[PDB]
Amino acid sequence: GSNVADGLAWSYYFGYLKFVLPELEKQIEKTSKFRSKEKFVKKMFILIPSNCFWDDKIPGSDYDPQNRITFEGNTEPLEKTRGGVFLRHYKHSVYEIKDGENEPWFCIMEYATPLLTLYDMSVAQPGELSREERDAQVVVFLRKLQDILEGDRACQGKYELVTFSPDRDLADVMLRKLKDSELEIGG
Template sequence: MDQIYIYVMQVVLAVGVTVGSQTFKQNDKYHWMFSIVRYVVYDLTIKCTKNLSSMGYDMLHKKRWLNTQLVENINTGQIIIYIGSIAILISNNEKVFSEDFLLLFIAYLILQYPELGTTPLSSISYGVGMACNFYEGYLMHVIPSDGGDFGGFIQNVQAFEAREGIVVPVRKLFIIITKSMYSPPDLQLFNKENRPDLSKLESCSVRIGDYSKSLEDRSRDVGGIRNRSYKNTAYKIHRQRGPPVYLVAECATPLYTLYRVMENKELYDDLAKVNVQDVCDDFCSTLLRLLDRSSECRDQVELVHYDDRDPEANLADVILNRIQQLEPRFEELISVRR
């Protein structure tokens, strides 16, 4: 409703300027009409060049072949106006583009130049914000050492290895990025129970009294909460041949939060039209960039994409393939018992 009021005020202002300047003449009404139609074409053409440039940049630098957000934001009404305006000009033997288009385009580019070095707050996407929150609010609590009792993620994994007499071939936190964004309470729920020929995940978080077969928890006072617990879960992958393979893994909980939001769109109407794939892409690319820049978390987190909608895909095998890529000697390593 506010946009309607602002639009009406702009119309009134435009009429006032026109009447006040006394530039409108009755015998020039056709000239005015064709000029307005032509400038509509100019404006929409310039907007189109900006969108096409954005898509080209994404294709070249972000390896995103189609910016679905831009495609979804295409205004059908503007397309109709654009085609209709061109048709009006052509049918009346009027030029679609005249020499003033170049001048208007140059003026537009000049006005855009001062904004190149600025990043308005509104340009921060939902996915970027989720990645920053996940990094600062979670990973920074479970990966680096705090300089005190908690020696960091690697030391925590080593303690688990020593306690269980096993070897974790890749000492990284595997973050599972599911296609649907759904995260089960236990990753072994992704196992294909009707396929005994496939590898299977099993959690190592069984507690016997105060003893835990998974990684040790870390407690920290955060945001007024005393002894807030942060933890990771170890898993082992049972294979048809060979000993089990151990790792530390979990799903990307921010994406699961987005999954819940999408399931309750009537409650979150501001996000009802968000493009989920773009949000996921922004989340993953931003998180990878943060991890690469961070001296405290670099090389300790691995993102693994898993299409949980594909009935033929098996998470355990997807992870095994990634472990093979990261550590080709993993079979030799896991044969060692401490």
């Protein structure tokens, strides 16, 4: 078959999200700077650009035209060996997002890395995955990932999927989602 998105979503979960998401808040709290910070939403914001592509660096990127996003630092690494085959270390990037004259937000942002495979396939093997087929697979990936994560009680409230077109301002998108997050001051 050609429905690559199903496999991408399941491996994204079992090979990463399943064990990083429940532990994320605790990992963040291991850093005093992060304990001290208010307006720090602890959910992982998983970024899903409709074009399966992004600048390697989020701050100042085409998705950040107003330069309101700044890299703050990384969380303390989680160590895990995968079936005794290879060793992995997992850590996440914290970003500051400006909110005018108010206190800026801190948040966890990450592009959905399985999208790299969709993009690579469309460029290296166009016969297997056309641009239009890639577009559709993004949607399939999103819907399956939603089903998987929503089926895991341990992941509840630990993430937020963010879909957007490449013409959008990520800072604006994120600011709105951060304000709509459950986190209140002192929380």
